[PDB]
Design a protein around this ligand. Sequence first.
Ligand SMILES: [Mg+2]
Ligand SMILES: [Mg+2]
Lengths: 170, 168
Amino acid sequence: ETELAFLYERDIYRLLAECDNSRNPDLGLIVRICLATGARWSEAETLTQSQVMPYKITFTNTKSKKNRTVPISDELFDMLPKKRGRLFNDAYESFENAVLRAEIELPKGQLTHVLRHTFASHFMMNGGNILVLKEILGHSTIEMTMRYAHFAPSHLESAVKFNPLSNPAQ
Amino acid sequence: ELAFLYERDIYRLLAECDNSRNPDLGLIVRICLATGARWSEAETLTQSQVMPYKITFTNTKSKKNRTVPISDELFDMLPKKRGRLFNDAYESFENAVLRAEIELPKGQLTHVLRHTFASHFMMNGGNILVLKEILGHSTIEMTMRYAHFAPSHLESAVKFNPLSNPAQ
Ligand SMILES: [Mg+2]
Ligand SMILES: [Mg+2]
């Protein structure tokens, strides 16, 4: 399955609706965190109150350079549970269930990465700087982010707009 | 270590060029500073490679071919002749740089104008991927050497994410 599947707006909103009606009250938020930051499933699922701060989230695996801080909206921040320790319980099993109700087809074993793919896909499609994206997802190399480059609306007419000759930066 | 020029240097360079015995020096320079063309790519530019508001550079080692758009004002001031548009402005270039009191590490002269284009392109908010094509970089690695000029804006994640602003 050569394709890195991602959801489109319509899917995205139908998935959320189903997630928000999941018998697991934490799913919605976990999915949202993922869509909003591009975090890996576990990264958002195991989130602790100390990674959350007024308008941003920090992800870390081992102190061994895996410390990323991804900015979120006031809206999302305000939705997060105020309690200490782990904000949510495990919710993966409930996810599979929601995705099915939303009529979402995905390649074998892709349910886990789909949200991250979606985030990156749209980020780039929205004109996001691939260099910023590499940091957000926490890739050790830019080659890893290159998988999302084709989404970037390329417009070479910028050479006239950004060249030193007509528009010197300094 | 790659050297590039700043506005003040650029204005003094153009000035020393608009005084060169070689009438082409100033033109070739403007080309490199607007497209990032290697020196030779612009120096040997032939009339057919030019088209209204875009230039097509070609084969260096690999038979390359890319087309960098340009401004009407740059085009409008190009030789309307045929065949090679200019002569050999390299020695004239060195002359101008020296007269401008511009110091550069060994052999940086051939690419300095292109470095300048890249650096400023990136500084001006240019898309690294676009810059990649513009310079004919086979690998994004080569282009990465300009990444540090890119203004980092992680707040953008708040406006580009599919939860709040799905592209479609
Ligand atoms: Mg099962
Ligand atoms: Mg000589």
